[PDB]
Subunit: 129 residues, 4 copies
Amino acid sequence: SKIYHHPVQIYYEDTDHSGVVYHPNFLKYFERAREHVIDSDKLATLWNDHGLGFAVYKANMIFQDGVEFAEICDIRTSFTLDGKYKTLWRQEVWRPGASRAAVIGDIEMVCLDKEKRLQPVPADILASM
Amino acid sequence: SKIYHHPVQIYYEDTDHSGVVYHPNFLKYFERAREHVIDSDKLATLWNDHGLGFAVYKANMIFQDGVEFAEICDIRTSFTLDGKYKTLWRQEVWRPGASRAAVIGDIEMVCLDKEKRLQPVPADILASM
Amino acid sequence: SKIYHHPVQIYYEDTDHSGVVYHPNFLKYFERAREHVIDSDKLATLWNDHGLGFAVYKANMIFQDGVEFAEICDIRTSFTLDGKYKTLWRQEVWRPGASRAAVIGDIEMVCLDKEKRLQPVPADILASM
Amino acid sequence: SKIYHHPVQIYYEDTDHSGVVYHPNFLKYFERAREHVIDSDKLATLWNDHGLGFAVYKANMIFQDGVEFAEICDIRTSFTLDGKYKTLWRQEVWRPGASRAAVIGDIEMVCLDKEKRLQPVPADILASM
Ligand SMILES: [Mg+2]
Ligand SMILES: [Mg+2]
Ligand SMILES: [Mg+2]
Ligand SMILES: [Mg+2]
């Protein structure tokens, strides 16, 4: 895919008392950013037409710098097809002008039927990206 | 009802960078405490036998003191029936030995059918409390 | 003040398994919207120049309709000064074209010194709104 | 270390509308469980006596099964020392009687000074485990 961009602002809800973003939250921001790549309409169409859904199977996170209250960051997201069944997503939290990401995620998503068996990703949901 | 007690420990997820529990979280703790009064089995039975569910209609919160990281507090919960349709819950966050609550909530819950019409609370779900 | 507008999109993180936004989350959205009215720079200036901060003292919520996954709503926020010490905020979650709010909050905020005593809100933090 | 156990109950706050625990939440539960291994008193002592804190550097998650509303699970946690600076934590969400974990996390934590340089973990914070 191309690199998608999704802005995230850090609010009170995002920080803990150590004074930085509470680390589990980054996976939430990554999930949000993915919802802008494969939106709810696409997911609903996949479910109704094909009986398929995507699930996160693995998420490997590297936390490289603390992020403060009131920062606006850019979530950079791209994915590749890995065979018929799996999508591998690279997601990164960036600051303007930085030379490296604050947080990196490698996310593996599988395409499952209602019997929780792997099924090929249909061509139509992939087509726009 | 009687006064129910539910312990809550304050973890990193609960605080913000101002150094106290992030205020929207108290309503979560109140919801948890209510799940110990009317558990999931009772809710499921209500839904399946009667087609009814409870919804929070109003929540009035008073935040009287900040709560710090790593505190263990006691959520005190009681409710009264208000007519046929409504339950009024008093919920309070307490510290050991305090003379007043840290946080107070008055919560009004309604009993709704699938048409979102008010319906009487059945006698069976109330009986144990 | 004037009516401020803040968009909120409903993601997976926002819903529960009953199929609507989990009610404590609305107070979070209200907090976000307030951060766009009195931003972090203003708060920091208040703290450093005056030794003052704002705290939510009371929040009275009415939940009038369920909000679904993937909705985009408009948070409408306005406030009034109530004497020297207190700000009263009206916040509402709206859908496009609706005639009434999905969720209403009346929020009372106090202006406190480090001794947790009420102090007058300085003219400068109010001036732009 | 030995295997520590920490119970987690799944409440409304934990699920999303797909009907299972929202995946970023598992890292929160893992953080909680770690707070029962190295409690706030130990962390505070480390900070004040040594000027050191722990940070999560990497978290590798495998999501092997969906977890439903109202389940009670057991978080199993153990760690090993990896050289002088790093602790490697294995954390797992288990159901009673299962033969495999629902969710697995491998978490790498580093011991940092205020200059964000790696420093040896002191013997005293490790001693009880
Ligand atoms: Mg198709
Ligand atoms: Mg019955
Ligand atoms: Mg001034
Ligand atoms: Mg020492």
